[PDB]
Amino acid sequence: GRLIYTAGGYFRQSLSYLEAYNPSDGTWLRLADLQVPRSGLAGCVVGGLLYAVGGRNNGNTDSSALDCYNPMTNQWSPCAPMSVPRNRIGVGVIDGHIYAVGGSHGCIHHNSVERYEPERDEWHLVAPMLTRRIGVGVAVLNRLLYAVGGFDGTNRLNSAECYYPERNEWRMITAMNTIRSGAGVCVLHNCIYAAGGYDGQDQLNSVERYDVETETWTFVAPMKHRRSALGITVHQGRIYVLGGYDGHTFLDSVECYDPDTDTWSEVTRMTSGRSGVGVAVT
Numbered sequence: 001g002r003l004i005y006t007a008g009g010y011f012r013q014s015l016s017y018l019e020a021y022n023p024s025d026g027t028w029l030r031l032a033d034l035q036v037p038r039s040g041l042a043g044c045v046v047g048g049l050l051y052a053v054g055g056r057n058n059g060n061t062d063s064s065a066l067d068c069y070n071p072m073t074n075q076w077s078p079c080a081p082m083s084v085p086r087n088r089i090g091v092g093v094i095d096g097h098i099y100a101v102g103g104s105h106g107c108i109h110h111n112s113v114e115r116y117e118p119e120r121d122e123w124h125l126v127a128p129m130l131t132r133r134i135g136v137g138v139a140v141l142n143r144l145l146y147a148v149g150g151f152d153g154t155n156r157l158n159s160a161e162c163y164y165p166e167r168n169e170w171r172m173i174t175a176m177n178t179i180r181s182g183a184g185v186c187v188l189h190n191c192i193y194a195a196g197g198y199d200g201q202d203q204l205n206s207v208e209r210y211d212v213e214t215e216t217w218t219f220v221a222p223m224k225h226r227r228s229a230l231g232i233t234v235h236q237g238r239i240y241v242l243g244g245y246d247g248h249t250f251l252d253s254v255e256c257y258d259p260d261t262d263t264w265s266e267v268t269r270m271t272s273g274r275s276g277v278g279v280a281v282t
């Protein structure tokens with residue numbers, strides 16, 4: 001029985017909350033705070049350890065930090081920092097290694113990507129992306145890392161591209177129907193989902209599914225609450241989006257997508273509304 005973990009976030013200030021949610025019984029656990037409050041970070045899991053990557057402390061400062069959380073010890077532990085601060089970062093995991101994709105340091109918009117080895121507490125740059133991307137969605141599919149949407153410092157993007165680890169190179173893939181920075185991007189039943197985000201003028205509630213075989217993006221059921229900078233994860237075959245910003249409110253709503261019925265239902269509320277959380281399941 002795995003939990004949904006939500007790290008950090010933002011409401012008025014950068015937060016240090018670490019909370020876990022149980023879809024079996026609707027309960028929320030309060031876990032050990034982060035050492036430094038952060039928003040705009042990303043979460044991931046490797047070997048049953050929770051990792052919190054990048055973001056910003058909002059002195060106000062973009063983070064190159066990597067911190068590890070052990071659910072068994074309920075303790076945070078610092079790791080090797082990344083080569084560069086990465087606010088509004090995307091991450092994915094390939095064979096127990098963490099890819100940090102894009103993000104920002106001040107006005108710098110990264111296209112660089114570095115890879116973390118837990119077994120060595122070491123980071124190494126890999127091939128840079130074709131596009132600078134901050135607020136980028138990241139999904140791992142078929143041992144390929146996909147980087148979806150974001151902002152390149154000039155335009156919001158509907159483009160997407162693909163990293164080939166054995167070849168260490170990136171190719172553009174089919175663009176999305178909608179422009180999206182700060183979307184929720186995950187993988188479910190062999191498709192990439194892109195939920196929400198910001199299209200340049202408003203926060204979106206549309207949801208597109210990328211089907212690899214056909215190389216097409218098709219819309220599916222939209223969310224109840226439009227949102228960007230949302231947390232997202234997959235748990236027992238359904239999608240969960242957590243919090244985010246809808247243009248005026250910092251949401252505490254958690255919506256759950258069932259792909260068998262193509263429905264979104266609100267399933268719980270966070271203990272407080274927040275944006276820019278890092279989210280992971282273990």
Ligand SMILES: CCOP(=O)(CC(=O)Nc1ccc(S(=O)(=O)N(CC(N)=O)c2ccc(N(CC(N)=O)S(=O)(=O)c3ccc(OC)cc3)c3ccccc23)cc1)OCC
Pocket residue numbers: 009010011039040055056058087088089134135136150151181182183197198228229245247275276277
């Ligand atoms: C000028 C008229 O005023 P306005 O109301 C209209 C407006 O532009 N809304 C708006 C437009 C586009 C986006 S975004 O999601 O796409 N995005 C930009 C990007 N380039 O990626 C992002 C913005 C902020 C982030 N956060 C962490 C951080 N380190 O920043 S946060 O969650 O904690 C946050 C904090 C404050 C806030 O607002 C009060 C909203 C959110 C993001 C974190 C991850 C990914 C993308 C983020 C968000 C809001 O807002 C003025 C302040």
